[PDB]
Amino acid sequence: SQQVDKIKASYPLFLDQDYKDMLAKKRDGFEEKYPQDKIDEVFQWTTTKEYQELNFQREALTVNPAKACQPLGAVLCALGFEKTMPYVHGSQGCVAYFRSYFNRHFREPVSCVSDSMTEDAAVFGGQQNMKDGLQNCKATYKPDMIAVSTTCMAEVIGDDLNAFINNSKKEGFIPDEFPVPFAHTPSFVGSHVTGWDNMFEGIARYFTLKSMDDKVVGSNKKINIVPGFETYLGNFRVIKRMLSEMGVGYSLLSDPEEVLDTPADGQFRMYAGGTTQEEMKDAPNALNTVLLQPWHLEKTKKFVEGTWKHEVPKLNIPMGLDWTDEFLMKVSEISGQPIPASLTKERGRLVDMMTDSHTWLHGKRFALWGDPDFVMGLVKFLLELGCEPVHILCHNGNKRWKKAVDAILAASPYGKNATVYIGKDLWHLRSLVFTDKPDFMIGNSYGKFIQRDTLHKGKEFEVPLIRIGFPIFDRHHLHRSTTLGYEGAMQILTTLVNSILERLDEETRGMQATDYNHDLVR
Amino acid sequence: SQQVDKIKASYPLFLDQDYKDMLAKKRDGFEEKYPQDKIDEVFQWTTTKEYQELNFQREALTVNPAKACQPLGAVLCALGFEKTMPYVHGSQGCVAYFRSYFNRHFREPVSCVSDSMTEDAAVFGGQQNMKDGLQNCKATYKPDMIAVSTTCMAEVIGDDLNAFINNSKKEGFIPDEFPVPFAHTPSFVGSHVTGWDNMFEGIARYFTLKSMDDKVVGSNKKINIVPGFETYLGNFRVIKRMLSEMGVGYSLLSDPEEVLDTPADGQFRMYAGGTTQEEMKDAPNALNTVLLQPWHLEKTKKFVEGTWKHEVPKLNIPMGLDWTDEFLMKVSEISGQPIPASLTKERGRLVDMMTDSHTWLHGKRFALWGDPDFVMGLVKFLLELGCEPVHILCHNGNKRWKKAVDAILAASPYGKNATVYIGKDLWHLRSLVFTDKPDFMIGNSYGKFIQRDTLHKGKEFEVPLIRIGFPIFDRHHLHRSTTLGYEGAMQILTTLVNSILERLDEETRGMQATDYNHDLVR
Amino acid sequence: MSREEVESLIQEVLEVYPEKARKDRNKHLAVNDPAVTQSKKCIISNKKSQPGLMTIRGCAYAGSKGVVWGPIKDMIHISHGPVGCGQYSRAGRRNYYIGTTGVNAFVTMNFTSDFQEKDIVFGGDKKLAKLIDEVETLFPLNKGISVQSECPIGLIGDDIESVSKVKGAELSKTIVPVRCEGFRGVSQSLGHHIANDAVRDWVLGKRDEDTTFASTPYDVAIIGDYNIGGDAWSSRILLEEMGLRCVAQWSGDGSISEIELTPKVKLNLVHCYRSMNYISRHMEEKYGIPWMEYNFFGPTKTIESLRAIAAKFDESIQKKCEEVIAKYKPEWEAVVAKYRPRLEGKRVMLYIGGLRPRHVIGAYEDLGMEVVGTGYEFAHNDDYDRTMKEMGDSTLLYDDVTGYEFEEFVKRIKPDLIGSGIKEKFIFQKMGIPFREMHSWDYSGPYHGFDGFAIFARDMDMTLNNPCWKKLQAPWEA
Amino acid sequence: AMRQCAIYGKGGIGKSTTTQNLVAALAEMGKKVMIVGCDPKADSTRLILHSKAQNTIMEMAAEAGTVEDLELEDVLKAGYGGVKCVESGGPEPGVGCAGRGVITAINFLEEEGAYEDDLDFVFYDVLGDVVCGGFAMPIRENKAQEIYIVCSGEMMAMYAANNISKGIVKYANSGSVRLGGLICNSRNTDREDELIIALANKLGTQMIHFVPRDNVVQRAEIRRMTVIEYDPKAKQADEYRALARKVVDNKLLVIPNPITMDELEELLMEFGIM
């Protein structure tokens, strides 16, 4: 029953007595459910150390992974280019999932097409699918470029993308001069960040491999910036703003911020902004190429050093204080422009915020997960703040990345209790936060479930989730935030300290019980 | 006892068994307090409607006021001028309190001096205090201008600021040309915003009143912007950014953002930035003067219309979509510059966020309080989002402001259940949120206590606090936020929708009880 | 360093003042020398602040309402006058209490008469009576009303005593009029004195003709402990762990019942001499209750004070004190063994109100830290007399230091850590010097007793050794 | 036009009565005048309005919220001969703070534009005991230009006039306010005129029209009017006409050089004996 004045959605409609009675009767009479005592005992067992040992002995089963497949990152990278349609050779369910994922994260339209390879296409190959799909996409959505990635089925059967696109061009399905960069993106290799790297390398080599004779390094006096897999629009914006204030000429290749942040003014823009084709053509003329997230831009690094002949600098992701300083100083040493006073003042204001908040930040223990470069930057910044990143999980990390992060932890007194896990999923991490409880965990929306689980052990065991990373589905407009540069460090610091303070306020809100510490001034 | 490995601060030190036993024994033996049943009965009574009637019949007692006294606003206004020392004629305890208040809100140094009027100065007048204080302050802190306000004692005894400063100048305590603007700021009249208005009017007439002969309106082709009492640095920044993007020449008088956001680089800067004296001298030459918060800039409006001969536009505070649009169109019609495409795109992105979040925002009921212009802007924006501002409280509001806000509510279908209270304190609002419960309350840090009180009636009656306004003491770096313009509206929308979503996540976190609605995707 | 250089530093700092201000301020700065018997020749204090010099001092209202009266839980304290004072003083001081706020406790609430212009012109006595009636109607569980005067009340001669008497008789309530108008005195010290006199005249004598309280020989009352961060509690658990019965706490977590029961106790343990020595002397000379100064800052001072207090009782109390010392010895020893190596040899400068500038020196020295500069906002001659026996040789002493003076002293001395209030914190944080709030404990604490010592050492190490202080200079600058 | 005068002097020396009679004389000469009473006793406009001015700025402001809600027409009322009359309100004796009320009332008059054009004179009748800065509100900058001190041959009256001059000195140096002269109200003392003239010379000023003590004033004021309304042809009415004429044609505006207590005693021995 409902009252027309106050209408209850599912919560709290299904807390009504009739609905509770119905659910109890359903479970009692037809579900054959385990007894509540058995369920409680099994949950308590799952929160134990022996269960964690069993969990970490897993070899074949993955539970709640913290990664996606390559073509998602390929689609994002392709989206970062002007009037470019992402085109995934393979089955259409993949494209539907990629679009839904990015739609839920960004709350914006995400354009991507499939060539709809069915069983007959699996058996006979996707040549006809490629020809018809390229023709249909170009005629329907009028892109100036079609960037081709693959689903797992086309990678298993060896659908040769190069041959398929070439045959499409020579047979008149698409114009011969129409740019169709391609990249093999096997979903059973690496992760979504690997797909981003592969797609970017494909686009770069499409626009630069053959026409290298007339290229001389530095002739355009710009700096190439490769962002990598990035889902914070403020990160693109902050890199652009810091380079603009610095008087540095730059070329941000794969810039998707405009297409993912279009206005609602009565019309739908399928394409907006993005790296122009001329930018990629002229990229070899740059003074140098700086990789924003080098640890999933290895293939791009090999191509840039071996083909464009750019001495790509060894820079960590510009996250936190020290690494933003290093990034700015390297940009200075490359372009010859000095670091301006506005950037110095922004750095000083970040330092002032750190001094203002160190008492609440110091000693705080964290479990964090995400992509390797983001995770490493977060670890470095947390060490800068005096926090303890006790659990550091990277599902798609590798041994060398683990070595680098271990060396970073060894250089700080606040990395003594820190452990780096690679190839582990969020079930491992839920065990980790049960058996060695941190104060907070930082990660994407999936971590919410871990928080729920911790709250079931009790309020004193609950590990609150701080939502930084990808994807964030249960909050609105957090994709607009920043994590790079001094501005990103300021936003992260504000989020961390205010999460701590809100947690403390909640834990001291009980009148005559804990409100003696419910201080107005913190 | 303490474990050296894990040291407990007061929370949760005093939850230990020995401390709990000590507190219980102290209460039983020596406190002679009311029985817990009696305390529960009285609390339940205070949450009732009859108690609210008794509360709203109050005529003499104020409990938890949502306002401050005039000299606080005078000090804030004076701080927005270059190398200007705020100087409060009267008792030094006032200056200590103003400085502590602003230090806790901004987490920054706040420079202000007193002439330390004691009982002998109260009886004989503080003319010697004025002479010695002006001389000492100028010799010690070398300000380029000393801006003089008053405490209540100097206003009661009629300390003639003009005569005192003039005598100090003629007797050689301070140079005759040294600028010493003054304003009478009685704490028993108006509130802190009135003090801001009074101080600004005094500073304006000090630099402009006697030299109006060689002034012609529009000759500098600039626009005067008066911000009023503003404690969000992002508001100054957004007004500056929006005017400079528009290509409009502007002069923001009383700009304190630099002095309240100095960097930590091994140096303490007592002064930084601020409106120069030449800007105030040239202000009568402007095309027009726009008052950002007109409802506490009445004296400034009268002076600017009657002395500078500027036809001050009838503009509401540039908060929310419609009023930011009106502000931009008025600035365009004054300066002659068109609204640029970047501002239009920012407005469109605001609209996109509104459409992305309307389902969660729509129908939400709010109790809010603060200064009149900020409160009115919040009410207008909440109406734009489809929210219901049911309890609109403004302690320092007046009848005309109440009528304007009532007319605003009548123009929208979402203002039907809204009531505007003026002269009511936060105890009135505690009663209001107990008897007509909103979903959230928006206000400064004091509202936290109301939240505590609501949580004592039960978790279902708890009204969470959203911290927007002044002062904010229990969170860090919120003073850096923005509330004006499209950017401020975006920040407010993000805060509101994510507060709603975090509340819903908390209410659906109970496994097997309410977690059926613990959705990953919201 | 060296008695001569610091004197030269004092003269150089004073050089910028006008001659009157320089002549005044020279008498408020000194170099410590334990060869001095009376601080009158050394340093003078408790004098008028020089105008326009940006002093740190508060007012008598701050010393009365904000310090002494405010912490009392079950009493409602009304800031009589305009709205500013109570609003700025609302919950700025962390005098911790246990109660139900708004029902039977009111500490963090701001009760005010909110004087308008007509209240100044025509008087506020009728408004005060109506306010008392409204307080009764809306807060019926309050156990006392105090009326803290602000500046206009003192100026216009409002007869708050008459209102208090009439309304108290009419309602059988204790209504205490406090003439703590801010312009009286020179600082919070006269606020302390006025508040103590109000307690003596209106509260302390209510149970004089009452013998229904059972008194044990081990009855002590804690005086001048305001439960900052739970300080008093951390202190109290020690005393009652050595057999003593803590009848009263003044005034942090304090009830009016405890103040009324104070004359029934046998000993008065004064923590803050400066704020409550007046009432301690009054009770000594009226009820014959001896009072002793103690100190619960750091293990050395805590043990010394516990043994001194035990020596005033039977052998059972002394055995219980010894067992308390032996029980808590490993914990503070572990705290030292953990945090002293991180803090040994670090120099600290202090500037707090009237007791802590000298009381916490032992706690710092327990961690190998040397206090090179100290000073008071509002201490008297006797406070500096007590300070000389605690400060080291050739250490800077300042009274009512100005912002300029203290900034220059810090620049020259270059201490590793500064302990002062909220109005110096961000100034010295921007100079790259670790800062600890020594009033509010930087929203941490307690610092009293052994648990307080553990927290204090943790905070000192956390702020002193924070990595942020190594990042003040941008790497692209020399 | 627009001459702003402030009437001060020893308590009860006859400031209100002389001010009202002088204002009546000035208004009978076609001069537009306005009387502002800065005494919480709103008794400085009774002989002009023929009744006690019940409506005062402070009382109206307290009744009607604050002073901003007020209107001039509710406190500014005409009387005999076009004399506009306003009164600053005040508490009953022994309570509140009347100086703050005077400050607020005068600020309200300034802000509401009571000082319009076609107003030749504005007379601020102030109380005799200037106890605070508030009652010096009339002699603030740009408020009153001339100060008239009513005195008499009594030692206390001359001491009060000298003390008032000492208080004036700070405002006179701060602004452009000066001492026009010493109006003398006769108290029938030995060498009254000699004492007033000597004191005025010592202060650096003049004695303007020593006014005789006559009961026609008492009669006229008990009939709720000035002498001009009561007996225009009486001797004291002509004396008030002469006082008005001497006020109009006055140019001795000086900063007083007040004399110490010793010099005052020498003046009393020199001119107060025989």
Ligand SMILES: Nc1ncnc2c1ncn2[C@@H]1O[C@H](COP(=O)(O)OP(=O)(O)O)[C@@H](O)[C@H]1O
């Ligand atoms: N020239 C005068 N002749 C007779 N009586 C006078 C004269 N001047 C003043 N008075 C009387 O002396 C008394 C003094 O009252 P008032 O004029 O109000 O003095 P003040 O305004 O200084 O307080 C009045 O009653 C008045 O009738």
Ligand code: ICS
């Ligand atoms: S009362 Fe005094 S200024 Fe003795 S007014 Fe002040 S809570 Fe200080 S050095 Mo704030 S004489 Fe207490 C003090 Fe000391 S408020 Fe606290 S810390 S021990």
Ligand code: CLF
């Ligand atoms: S149509 Fe359907 S969703 Fe597509 S793959 Fe095939 S079953 Fe699966 Fe899978 S890992 Fe990624 S999303 Fe694909 S490329 Fe393969």
Ligand code: CLF
């Ligand atoms: S020294 Fe002390 S704090 Fe100052 S006033 Fe006086 S009692 Fe109070 Fe009050 S309302 Fe504001 S803060 Fe003052 S100007 Fe008056």
Ligand code: ALF
């Ligand atoms: F007694 Al008066 F002016 F009325 F001196």
Ligand SMILES: [Fe+3]
């Ligand atoms: Fe800061």
Ligand SMILES: [Fe+3]
């Ligand atoms: Fe959208």
Ligand SMILES: [Mg+2]
């Ligand atoms: Mg008179």
